[PDB]
Design a protein around this motif. Structure first.
Motif, PDB file in Angstrom:
ATOM      1  N   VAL A 124       0.855  -1.177   0.000  1.00 53.27           N
ATOM      2  CA  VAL A 124       0.000   0.000   0.000  1.00 53.27           C
ATOM      3  C   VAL A 124       0.892   1.227   0.000  1.00 53.27           C
ATOM      4  O   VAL A 124       2.025   1.195   0.480  1.00 53.27           O
ATOM      5  N   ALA A 125       0.381   2.325  -0.535  1.00 54.53           N
ATOM      6  CA  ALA A 125       1.101   3.593  -0.558  1.00 54.53           C
ATOM      7  C   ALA A 125       0.319   4.564   0.312  1.00 54.53           C
ATOM      8  O   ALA A 125      -0.679   5.137  -0.129  1.00 54.53           O
ATOM      9  N   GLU A 126       0.770   4.741   1.544  1.00 57.50           N
ATOM     10  CA  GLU A 126       0.068   5.550   2.526  1.00 57.50           C
ATOM     11  C   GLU A 126       0.796   6.874   2.692  1.00 57.50           C
ATOM     12  O   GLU A 126       1.960   6.898   3.097  1.00 57.50           O
ATOM     13  N   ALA A 127       0.115   7.968   2.376  1.00 51.62           N
ATOM     14  CA  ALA A 127       0.655   9.309   2.535  1.00 51.62           C
ATOM     15  C   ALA A 127      -0.290  10.106   3.413  1.00 51.62           C
ATOM     16  O   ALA A 127      -1.505  10.075   3.208  1.00 51.62           O
ATOM     17  N   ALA A 128       0.262  10.809   4.396  1.00 53.41           N
ATOM     18  CA  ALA A 128      -0.551  11.537   5.367  1.00 53.41           C
ATOM     19  C   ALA A 128       0.166  12.836   5.699  1.00 53.41           C
ATOM     20  O   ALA A 128       1.104  12.843   6.497  1.00 53.41           O
ATOM     21  N   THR A 160       0.444  13.189  -1.749  1.00 50.00           N
ATOM     22  CA  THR A 160       0.239  12.297  -2.879  1.00 50.00           C
ATOM     23  C   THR A 160       0.549  10.866  -2.480  1.00 50.00           C
ATOM     24  O   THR A 160       1.601  10.594  -1.897  1.00 50.00           O
ATOM     25  N   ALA A 161      -0.364   9.956  -2.803  1.00 49.32           N
ATOM     26  CA  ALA A 161      -0.152   8.528  -2.633  1.00 49.32           C
ATOM     27  C   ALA A 161      -0.437   7.855  -3.962  1.00 49.32           C
ATOM     28  O   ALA A 161      -1.529   8.012  -4.514  1.00 49.32           O
ATOM     29  N   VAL A 162       0.536   7.114  -4.480  1.00 46.73           N
ATOM     30  CA  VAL A 162       0.409   6.451  -5.769  1.00 46.73           C
ATOM     31  C   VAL A 162       0.644   4.965  -5.571  1.00 46.73           C
ATOM     32  O   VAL A 162       1.706   4.557  -5.090  1.00 46.73           O
TER      33      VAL A 162
END
Lengths: 99, 99, 99, 99, 99
Positions: free
Chosen positions: A26-30, A75-77
């Motif tokens: 998973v690509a988790e951006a916060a 951004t999460a990709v």
């Protein structure tokens, strides 16, 4: 008298699988600013900038020229998680007893 | 009288798998500013900048020329997690008893 | 007298799979500003900027020229999660007993 | 006397699969400003900007020229989740007993 | 005396599948401003901007020229979720007993 959580009691040829909160590829951006701030009687004057800013408390002329580009943001990709064959498995079990 | 968490009691040919909060191939990005700040009667004047800033308390002329690019921000990228064959497994068990 | 959560009691050739909150190939983006802020009697004057800003408390002329581009915002992209064959499985079990 | 949650009691060749809140290939974007803010007697003067701003408390002339583009906003894109063959399975079980 | 939730009691060749709140290939976008704000006796003066703003408390001339484009807004796009063959399954079981 046999209380038990995710185990395996008086059984035979049993499996148990338990995947909880399992992130797999998973690509988790916060991008946050306050995550638990707690003020009590406190006078605060904070401020954040993500980009270009021209701040002041007193001025005669403020000029801001963005002739190029100001790119900001969280951004999460998730690009090609699985290419070709191959698997992302979780909580897997079996009792394959071929005969 | 047999209380037990994720174990294996009076059993035979049993498996137990338990994956909790298991990150496998994840891209975790977290850009924060406060994560537990606790003020009590405190007068604070903080400030953060992620990019280009022109700050002041008093000025006559402020000029900001972004002729190029100001790129900021939290980024998480999950590119090709699995290419070709091969697996990402979690919480896996079996009792394969082929005959 | 046999109380039990996601386990396996006096059984034979059984499987149990339990996937909870299992993110698999997800693109999670979260751009927030306050996630638990708690003020008590506190006088605050915060402020956030995601882009281009021209702030002041007193001025005679403010000019802002965005001749290019100001791109901001939270972005989550889930591109080709599965290309070709291959699987994303969760909570999988079986008792394949071929004969 | 046999109370049990998602398990498997005195059975034979049984499977159980339980996928809860399982995100698989999802693009989740959440741009928020307050998610739990709790004020008690507190005088606050916050403010957020996502784009281009020309703020002031007193001015004689404010000019804002957006000659290019100001693109903001929360975006979630779920592009080709499954290309070609291959599956996204959840809560799967079977007792295949071919003969 | 046999109370049980989504399990499998004194049975044979049974499957159980239970998918709850399982997002599979979804594009979830949520741009909010307050999600749990709770004020008690608190005098607040917030304000948010998603785009271009020319704010003031006192001015003689405000001019805003959007000669280009100001694009904002929450966007969720679910593009080709399944291309070609391949499945998105949830809560699947079977007892295939071919003979």
């Amino acid at each position: 008298m046999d209380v038990f959580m995710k185990g395996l009691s008086k059984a035979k040829e049993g499996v148990v699988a338990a995947a909880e909160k399992t992130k797999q590829g998973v690509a988790e951006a916060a991008g946050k600013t306050k995550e638990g701030v707690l003020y009590v009687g406190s006078k605060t004057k904070e401020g954040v900038v993500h980009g270009v800013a021209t701040v002041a408390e007193k001025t005669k002329e403020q000029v801001t020229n963005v002739g190029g580009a100001v790119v900001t943001g969280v951004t999460a990709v998730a690009q090609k998680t699985v290419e070709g064959a191959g698997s992302i498995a979780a909580a897997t079990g079996f009792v394959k007893k071929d005969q």
